[PDB]
Amino acid sequence: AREVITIHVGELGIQIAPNFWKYLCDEHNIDYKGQEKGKIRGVIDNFFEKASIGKWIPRTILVDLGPNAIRKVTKKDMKDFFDPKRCVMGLAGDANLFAKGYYSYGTRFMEEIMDKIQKEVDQTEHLQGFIVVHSIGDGTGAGLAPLIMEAIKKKHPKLVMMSYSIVPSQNMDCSTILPYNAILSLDKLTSCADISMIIDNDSIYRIVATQGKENELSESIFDQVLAKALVEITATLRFNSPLNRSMMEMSTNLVPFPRNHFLMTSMSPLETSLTSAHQKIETKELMQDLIDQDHILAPITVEKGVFTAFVIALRGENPHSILQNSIKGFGDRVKFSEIFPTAIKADSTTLTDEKLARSGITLMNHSGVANLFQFLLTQFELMYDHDAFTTWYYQEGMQPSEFEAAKNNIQKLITEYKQDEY
Amino acid sequence: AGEIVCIQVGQAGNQIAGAFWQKICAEHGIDPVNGKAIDVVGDTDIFFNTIGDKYIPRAVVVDLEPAVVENIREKFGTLFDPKSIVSGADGAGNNFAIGFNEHGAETLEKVMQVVEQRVSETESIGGFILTHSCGGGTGSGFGSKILKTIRERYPKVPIFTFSIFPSPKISETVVEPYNAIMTLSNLIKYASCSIVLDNEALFSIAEKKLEVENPSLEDLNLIIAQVLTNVTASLRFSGTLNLDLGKLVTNLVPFSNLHFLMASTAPLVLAGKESYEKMTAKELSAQVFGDEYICAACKPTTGRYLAASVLFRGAVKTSDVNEAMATVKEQNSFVNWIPTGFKISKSETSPKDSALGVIMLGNNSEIVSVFERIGANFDRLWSRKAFAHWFTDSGFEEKDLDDARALVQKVIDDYRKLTEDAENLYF
Amino acid sequence: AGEIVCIQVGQAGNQIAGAFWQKICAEHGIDPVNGKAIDVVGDTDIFFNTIGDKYIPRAVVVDLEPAVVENIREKFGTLFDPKSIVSGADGAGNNFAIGFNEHGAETLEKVMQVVEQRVSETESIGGFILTHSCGGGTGSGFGSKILKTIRERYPKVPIFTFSIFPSPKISETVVEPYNAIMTLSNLIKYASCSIVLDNEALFSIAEKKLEVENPSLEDLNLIIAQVLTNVTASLRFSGTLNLDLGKLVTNLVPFSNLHFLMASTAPLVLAGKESYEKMTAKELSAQVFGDEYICAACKPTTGRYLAASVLFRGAVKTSDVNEAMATVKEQNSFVNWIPTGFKISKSETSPKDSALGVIMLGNNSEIVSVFERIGANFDRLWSRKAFAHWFTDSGFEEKDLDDARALVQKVIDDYRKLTEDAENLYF
């Protein structure tokens, strides 16, 4: 079993954990106590460790510079599921600064963190890779997640590392220093991860609100959508799928150059509870929905930008003759460079959710990511050039040239993604 | 971890903090006059030291007054631990110089020993909160020496001060502007954040938003206490995502000397089901950002914001927060360089007298008008040297009175220059 | 075969048991003030000795009080047989040492003769039930000597004790913690199971779950009696599958010294059709396991269970029991070694005032908080030796007061250690 180790870093990555792990528990027929619930299905071993007893243990580590995200997750939301010896807690938190997560505070926990990671690594014969789930907003997520990633890559250089980077909103999750942490941490993700998924919370809020225009939803829906997208990305790593069979294949399929690894996603039906009653989603509509504006979890229109890679992973019966006509029917909405064939790959895997006829998710390497980076970079520059809030970072060791370096690296990254636009 | 030590200095400081502690004890489920509880909720460890079944509020109670302990037993029962109460010998007669210079070395050493014990019963220090009044003789001068002393012993720890400034129209004593400037000079140098409150604003609120007829200071303190309990909700009720004092300093203070904040809350409800279930986040945001709930003599809708934060309590819908805040961004005025404007947070636990509630804090350039009025009153008295002998015969030089004024003017000039420059930072 | 002999000791013991007997007589169809019946239902032989058309409850009524028989005739008519009532001469003035040491050999011998006669009219002894109050002078000391004496004469027979412990907040007498610890020490050594009840919990229930305004002890005893009648339903109404006292001891007590159980019931209905037909097993399970119906000053949803049992009464669907219990297992916390958690039973016969009802019992580690409070109150009084002369001048040595305390602490330490170790027994 090619086993994956999942690490949740920061208050949001931890907030997500109970939704992510409950989906996996139900998907594979395991209860929330780790007990088997009937017949186990899928390659359970890839995400769960088998205990000396009948219990399955999520193969995961929770990291928080304060005590609170972990305390709520392991004591109130999903009791007895997470192993307490795999939880790392600090006391001070991060004061919302990148500087604490990466230079002044979070560094004292690296021996503890790498020790716990090795204990988890030592339990597996065939380790495929790591998934690091983190916010790029707050200092713990923005700071430690790259600190952890670098420590792992220097010890286990042959593994594939994937990050799930969550970009906070400009409204419900906003912060007055968001642009500093976002640029300072993109600068490190650029050299740290092999694959980096970008999920934009503002897209989630407007997409769910659109789907919910007819009803009252639930406040839990925003977290369920964010958690589900990770579960679906990973579906092919858990079931014997004819696609993204392994993390190494995701890397070879989607990332042509070491720096161009930032990926976008699209998902349909977003959540089962959003699409209820008569939901006979025919193979034809599902593929049109996946390139629709209201299914893309980014401020990206596929028609406005250029594709470098595009993989569509469906679940349930999806006849191949339909998938091919749907792709041909994309026309010029899905366009690549003249140095590439229109390398759009699609197929389907096993469905576990008894309420849905079919579903799917896509992974896109598209130039539109550059627009998010430029948006955040412009905000960074307005603040930086007039020293807003820089004293708080300088006080913890961020010599000013550190900010200048991040500024230049991101402008170069934006420039490179837009090369095919010109 | 984010444990809080409160310091209460002087009569106003003790009465305001008293109202706070008794409201905190209602939300957590503790007896306000005994400290005894069986079943409590929330993270009580942030503010209380629990021994057996008694929850002891972590506070240092300070006065210069000869019988401060008895004065507390009579109103607060046994809620406060007498070992934390520091009594004085004579008192400061509304004279900053007595609270600041001629207080007695022993008085200050005892206060510091009490503070050290309170910080010694913590796994970590989350911050200090100082409650006081700028026109007094102990809450001004002694409270100021305490900020100096605390910041020297514990640098890099967020100190929040809540203080009463002179009222805009009528004044209390003639000496009040001298006490107010020197207090402000020390707040400028030592606090991480300061919340500016005054009684004129609070009285208008008490008479128009509360149902109470002919309110006294006892009622007025429930508005201040409501600001204090709401600003600490996320700390007390945890949550996966939350706000500590260090989150507020990082997000609201763009420069080290522009930390003076305005505060506003709604709804204001006196104990009992006297409220109405408006249940609308949109209405509460519209109210908290209006001028009618501002707890200081200023008019924020006519100024410009450097930053602001909003904490929503109770079962507030995400969708309403986003729409409500969109309205706020469209109606108000912000400075371009800070491009995101706000810090937004939610805590699902309701205040005891309302299902929903909102607290807002922020940096509004309008605040200089408070400081400018104080400055001008001082300048006229200072030029004529009226009541001045009371400060120079108590250890100050004219130089100290002049330097304190100069520091205050520097802050005013920095807020105003930034605000005027801002009009063209958009072109 | 599973015949039950009840022993009632002291005033509280007699009033609580009295309420029980009168409710039992309503479900079986017997006149509560005469014992006379023509047509009865259920297995009346478990609790009553039937002679002619009179059903005589099998109970030993014990006091030290000079006129206990007359005091019973006035409230219970002729339901109890006077030959089973043991009167005293002086009384124990809330002093364990008088009930335990200085009671009179003759008083105890008569109680034992009455017990022997009651066990001599049985084909088999199913168990004994003792009803009493830990802070009294007879229900504590004399009731304790009776447990010692009964267990020595009839070892291997399940003794269940139902007892009132001090309330968590206010206390009755200053001597109460001495009486409570020595009573607890003897419960630890001699009972098979003990149900911990107290008045503070019961009053909150009486004021919030019952419709009665300003309830007295007379109303409070109907909550205790409801616990007692429901816990004996399977015994009284038979069934192919059922629960005797020996089934409860085997299933709920994993170690010989951890037999202290919590009890909870719902719905609570006063005689008359004042109830509502909720008819839902799911709702009753949600309620019985919440904190609001617990009859002791503890908060079980925050602790960990070693074992628990649930008895459903009336026309409860199997399907709802399974779903309802699945919810309970998901929401609560259990210790890993005991892997099955529960003992579940059903009795198809409805309680007289509701079609459905549920009783739950269990071992929740939270129970130590009751014992810890008692321990601490004792330690403070014991250290100062206040009211101590009353125990040592009545035959106890300081050694006995200290050993009783030590045994109580052993039980507390065993519950707490097990509970803390439990967190890692899952990895």
Ligand SMILES: Nc1nc2c(ncn2[C@@H]2O[C@H](COP(=O)(O)OP(=O)(O)O)[C@@H](O)[C@H]2O)c(=O)[nH]1
């Ligand atoms: N809001 C509020 N203001 C108060 C209260 N008590 C006093 N004040 C204000 O605080 C100012 C200074 O008070 P003072 O009694 O001289 O304090 P002290 O000398 O430092 O102990 C007064 O002039 C009032 O304007 C109170 O209970 N609440």
Ligand SMILES: Nc1nc2c(ncn2[C@@H]2O[C@H](COP(=O)(O)OP(=O)(O)O)[C@@H](O)[C@H]2O)c(=O)[nH]1
């Ligand atoms: N629930 C309940 N509690 C009672 C009742 N009567 C007394 N109590 C409690 O039992 C405690 C001890 O009672 P006491 O009269 O001294 O009994 P005795 O000396 O052993 O006969 C009192 O302090 C009360 O708290 C009753 O009818 N029901």
